């Protein structure tokens, strides 16, 4: 009655105004996909090491 | 997601003056009486149905 | 001025009628303004006697009021303001600044009659709250979103618990707090509001990571009865309309009980056992039921409630002890050992205080000294009659371990700077639990007792080993 | 759009007519509206104000009718029309309430949206009487051993739970609603108990970690929530057992068998305190009301074990009441232990010696006990009993230079005692707590170190379920032992042992 | 591979066993054992390696 009246004039009449997309972005994080686990170093290097391992290396104690 | 479910809220805050405006131009329009004598004669029609 | 105008028929006490004229009522928790020279007093409805005469309960003094004066009618709940600029000052029932950091810059208000979210809303648990205190860590860890409660005796350090975890936690933490004082000393108050000023977290020369709303004692009983509810609402925005986590502090909840005792009795209400209101489950269950961590936020209550006489038999306490999640006992013996923490470690309990979700070692350190803290309780009698000697080995490795644990247990806080001067000391959750259980096995057992008597982690005990050995 | 669809279903309401028996609010204070008017109204009727709140009318006196009102004042105001809904409290009922947590009235607070019911029954009717009777005999296996066998009980029984204040009092009961699940998956529906857990006065977080973890255990499709929360009120939470009761009357009356917990009478005692002094009707002892016990007496004496000619059927019931700090001595546990067919009485020096279950089996009884309990189960734990019995009386001698026999009993004892422990939230099959209790029995156990107990009983399990799972499904399925059973048995456990 | 990893540290504790000393020798198993342990940590605590848009 005065149900159906003021639905079909309440829906009608009154638009729905959509939010500011501009304020969604601002309370979501923006982010922008990390980059590289890194590449480290290789370990040790020159024969340095070889000789340094080898001549080292009698640890085995007597 | 979570800005989405607070738009959906939004939208019945939205609505809930939309409610408010509807109230106030029924009391404001002579619909308030039309739709009294409406009213009227159709608890006339109830009311004789008993 | 409404032409809702009504003329106070009865002062009697807090219980003030109001005679509201022909047709026009007011409705059950609405707010009544009756303007004075003594600003606005605010009467809660809270009874429709009919005849357009209605019974409210005041808020502010009832003194000089004429017999059949004005009453204008602000028609709905008591509203109160919220904002992110109520942050960063104290807060007066009636929502006016009493530290007078100028006029709240009020975004929104409500009422202070919210309802508590359904179960549909509510977002299970699972965030592990960790406080850096050793007791609470490993013995009953916290969780985010929970209802800790700091049961003890007559602020038995019970403001400086408070005030150390606020200390931790809330600086810590990045969202906000809310710190809500009901019935406390307006001496600690000004204390309190000195020394969150100090530890800045309360700047005014910024903004605040808390909000403060002190309701101290000398407030009428109806008063008293409606800070807690004031605080509440403020938290309530925090939570949903920030949307930011929080952590509630609510102090003394005892007083909340007991305000609304007294002013059930003025309604006329059948007081119940040890004369408390029967609506004091409801009022507690509606207190807590609205803090809760839902899809739009989390809040974590501290509520500190005072037990009277040490007896948690009292119905009062023991109705909070059910409604609450994390639980404390905090007990004067312990205090008078010397240990700050105050807590008594066997009634520890908490929501979070499982098995695996506390990890299995946890589960386990825990369990062995529970059980070893209890064997030396036990055992307390046998040395009390038959001495100390008749014990076995296996009771006396037991008992230097128990007597070793509780002065391990011992953890210095900043809070005890005003105390001892010695400054506080927070062990991280991980470390505490290797710390435990390296002890539990007896590896310091090569440690003399007083070498963990106030002192902090490990590496403390350790040092003031070898501080006392030279 | 929710926006629409929303308006959608609030105009399709519309045309009243109903209203007739008008009442208007005379005072309105305390949730008990006074009204003049209403004069053909039943008693604790439905009435629907303008408002829109719901109430019973508890006081019917000559020039007013004191409606209860069951939700808040906030929007009752006084002099209101007050519609008769017409009609006494009514609920449904019928199986679609498993799976679902369901508010008092009925309303989904998971929101499961529309129940299958099958009947709107009233929510108070009176018990089933001396011939609505069978004799009990019927197993209730908790999957907790000494629940299991030191206290068991029948189906269609009273027994109560009373025990110390939250210390997984609710974890107690919840270790028997998973076990219900092994005999639920059996096609039988006498092995189908469908269970109702009544939570009374509880937050609604709490409920959903319950209902959480029922989900987790899959409980949750025979399980029925009835939900009166915390923040619930205190005329819901009256009829929350009640109203829970007539529930079980349907699977009951369908002559299937089913459990009911209504946790905790406590909580509904005080809202039962909340009515009556209110309604400025004199308290009882302990200021609790005086007719509670009148309560207490028609919501116990509901759960009952029919007649073979009016169906064999049951409604198994589990009353849990919360100590006071361990006092057992107050009004409402009073009351309630006399009606009780049973009792278990959870214990704080357990609970801290981290006996999990902190069961203290002394101050636990049954009135049924052994006459429900599977035979195999009973002739393996007569002498469990005894040797606990010697135990107990010989712990205190347990504090220095002990006698021989004593140390023997201590010895056996002290690793029965470890036995019982049960890691909380799992229960065990019947087939295999025979075999763990029949170890001990034959005292193979004393030969095992006490850390050790546990290790041997899962292993001693596997031990069973590899090599004899003849045996394992023989005590199942002949569910009695024959002498040749126990004696292959007893072979199986001297090997395990022996590794 | 995980197994080598941990099989020649347990391997090294008993050859220890037969050449005295062990100065690099738990270096070495330390070494194997912890890259190992962080692997298969990491490859079963495992989040997806793109995001749904399935449902959300």
């Not at chain 3, 003194?63 to 709905?76: N, S």
């Not at chain 3, 005890?416 to 435990?436: H, M, N, Q, W, Y």
């Not at chain 4, 004069?39 to 000559?62: D, R, T």
């Not at chain 4, 009961?173 to 006498?190: F, H, P, V, Y």
């Amino acid at each position: 009655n005065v149900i159906q009246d003021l639905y079909l004039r309440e829906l009608k009449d009154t638009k729905l105004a959509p939010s500011t997309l501009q304020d969604a972005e601002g309370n979501v994080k923006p982010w922008n996909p990390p980059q590289k686990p890194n590449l480290p170093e290789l370990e040790l290097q020159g024969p340095e090491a070889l000789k340094a391992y080898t001549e080292q290396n009698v640890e085995t104690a007597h | 997601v979570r800005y989405e479910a607070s738009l959906r809220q939004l939208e019945q805050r939205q609505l809930a003056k939309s409610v408010i405006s509807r109230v106030q131009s029924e009391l404001g329009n002579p619909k308030f009486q039309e739709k009294v004598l409406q009213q009227s004669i159709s608890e006339i029609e109830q009311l004789l149905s008993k | 001025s409404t032409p809702i105008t009504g003329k106070v028929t009865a002062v009697i006490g807090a219980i003030v009628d109001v005679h509201f004229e022909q047709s026009e009522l007011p409705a059950i928790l609405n707010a009544l303004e009756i303007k004075t020279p003594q600003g606005k007093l605010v009467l809660e409805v809270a009874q429709h006697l009919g005849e357009n005469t209605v019974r409210t309960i005041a808020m502010d003094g009832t003194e000089g009021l004429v017999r059949g004066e004005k009453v204008l009618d602000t028609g709905g709940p008591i509203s109160v303001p919220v904002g992110r600029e109520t942050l960063g000052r104290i807060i007066n029932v009636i929502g006016e600044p009493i530290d007078e950091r100028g006029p709240i810059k009020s975004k929104l208000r409500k009422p202070i009659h919210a309802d508590p979210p359904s179960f549909a809303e509510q977002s299970t648990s699972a965030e592990i709250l960790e406080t850096g205190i050793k007791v609470v860590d490993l013995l009953a860890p916290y969780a985010r979103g929970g209802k800790i409660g700091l049961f003890g005796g007559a602020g038995v350090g019970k403001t400086v618990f408070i005030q150390e975890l606020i200390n931790n936690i809330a600086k810590a933490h990045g969202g906000f707090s809310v710190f809500t004082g009901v019935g406390e000393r307006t001496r600690e108050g000004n204390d309190l509001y000195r020394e969150m000023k100090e530890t800045g977290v309360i700047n005014l020369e910024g903004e605040s990571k808390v909000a403060l709303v002190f309701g101290q004692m000398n407030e009428p009983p109806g008063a008293r009865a409606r800070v807690a509810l004031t605080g509440l609402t403020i938290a309530e925005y925090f939570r949903d309309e920030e949307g930011q986590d929080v952590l509630l502090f609510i102090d003394n909840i005892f007083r909340f009980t007991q305000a609304g005792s007294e002013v059930s009795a003025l309604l006329g209400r059948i007081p119940s056992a040890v004369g408390y209101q029967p609506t004091l489950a409801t009022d507690m269950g509606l207190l807590q039921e609205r803090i809760t961590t839902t899809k739009k936020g989390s809040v974590t209550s501290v509520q500190a409630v005072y037990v009277p006489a040490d007896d948690l038999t009292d119905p009062a306490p023991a109705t909070t002890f059910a409604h609450l999640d994390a639980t404390t006992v905090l007990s004067r013996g312990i205090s008078e050992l010397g240990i700050y923490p105050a807590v008594d470690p066997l009634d520890s309990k908490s929501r979070l205080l499982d098995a695996a979700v506390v990890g299995q070692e946890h589960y386990d350190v825990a369990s062995k000294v529970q059980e070893t803290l209890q064997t030396y309780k036990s055992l307390q009698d046998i040395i009390a009659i038959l001495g100390m000697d008749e014990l076995s080995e296996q009771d006396k490795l037991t008992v230097e371990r128990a007597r070793k644990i509780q002065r391990f247990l011992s953890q210095p806080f900043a809070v005890a700077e005003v105390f001892t001067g010695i400054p506080g000391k927070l062990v991280r959750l991980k470390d505490t639990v290797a710390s435990f259980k390296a002890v539990l096995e007896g590896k310091y057992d090569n440690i003399p007792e007083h070498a963990f008597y106030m002192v902090g982690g490990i590496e403390d005990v350790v040092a003031k080993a070898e501080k006392l050995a030279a | 759009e929710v926006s629409s669809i929303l308006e959608e279903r609030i105009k399709g309401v519309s045309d009243e007519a109903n209203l007739n028996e008008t009442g208007r609010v005379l005072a309105v204070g305390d949730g008990i509206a006074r009204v003049f008017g209403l004069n053909n109204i039943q008693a604790e009727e439905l009435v629907e104000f303008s408002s829109g709140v719901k109430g019973m009318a508890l006081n019917l006196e000559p020039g007013q009718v004191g409606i209860v009102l069951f939700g808040s004042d906030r929007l009752v105001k006084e002099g209101e029309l007050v519609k008769r809904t017409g009609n006494i409290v009514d609920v449904p009922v019928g199986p679609g309430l498993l799976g679902r947590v369901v508010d008092a009235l009925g309303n989904p607070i998971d929101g499961k949206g529309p129940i299958d019911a099958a009947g709107r029954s009233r929510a108070q009717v009176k018990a089933p009487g001396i011939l609505p009777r069978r004799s009990v005999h019927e197993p209730v296996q908790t999957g907790l051993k000494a629940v299991d066998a030191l206290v068991p009980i029948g189906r269609g029984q009273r027994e109560l739970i009373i025990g110390d204040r939250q210390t997984g009092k609710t974890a107690v009961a919840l270790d028997t609603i998973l076990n219900q699940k092994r005999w639920n998956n059996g096609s039988d529906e006498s092995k189908k108990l469908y269970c109702v857990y009544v939570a009374v006065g509880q937050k609604r977080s709490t409920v959903a970690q319950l209902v959480q973890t029922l989900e987790q255990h899959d409980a949750m499709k025979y399980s029925i929530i009835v939900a009166a929360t915390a923040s619930e009120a205190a005329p819901l939470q009256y009829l929350a057992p009640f109203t829970a009761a007539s529930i079980g009357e349907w699977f009951r009356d369908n002559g299937k068998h089913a459990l009911i917990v209504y946790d905790d009478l406590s909580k509904q005692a005080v809202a039962y305190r909340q009515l009556s002094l209110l309604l400025r009707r004199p308290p009882g002892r302990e200021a609790y009301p005086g007719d509670v016990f009148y309560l207490h007496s028609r919501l116990l004496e509901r759960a009952a074990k029919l007649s073979e000619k009016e169906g064999s059927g049951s409604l198994t019931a589990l009353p849990v009441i919360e100590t006071q700090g361990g006092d057992v001595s107050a009004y409402i546990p009073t009351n309630v232990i006399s009606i009780t067919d049973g009792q278990i009485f959870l214990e704080a020096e357990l609970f801290y010696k981290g006996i999990r279950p902190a069961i203290n089996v002394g101050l636990s009884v049954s009135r049924v006990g052994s006459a429900a309990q599977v035979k195999a189960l009973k002739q393996v734990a007569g002498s469990l009993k005894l040797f606990l019995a010697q135990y107990r009386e010989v712990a205190a001698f347990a504090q220095s230079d002990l006698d021989a026999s004593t140390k023997q009993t201590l010895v056996r004892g002290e690793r029965l005692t470890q036995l019982l422990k049960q890691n909380q939230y799992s229960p065990l099959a019947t087939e295999e707590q025979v075999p763990l209790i029949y170890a001990g029995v034959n005292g193979h156990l004393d030969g095992i170190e006490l850390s050790r107990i546990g290790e041997f009983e899962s292993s001693f399990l596997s031990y069973l379920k590899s090599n004899h799972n003849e045996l394992l499904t023989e005590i199942r399925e002949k569910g009695e032992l024959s002498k040749e059973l126990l004696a292959s048995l007893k072979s199986a456990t001297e090997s395990f042992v022996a590794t | 591979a995980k197994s080598a990893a941990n099989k020649l540290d347990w391997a090294k504790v008993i050859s220890s066993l037969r050449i005295t000393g062990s100065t690099a020798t738990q270096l070495s198993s330390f070494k194997k054992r912890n890259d190992e342990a962080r692997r298969q940590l990491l490859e079963l605590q495992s989040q997806p390696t793109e995001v749904d848009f399935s449902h959300y």
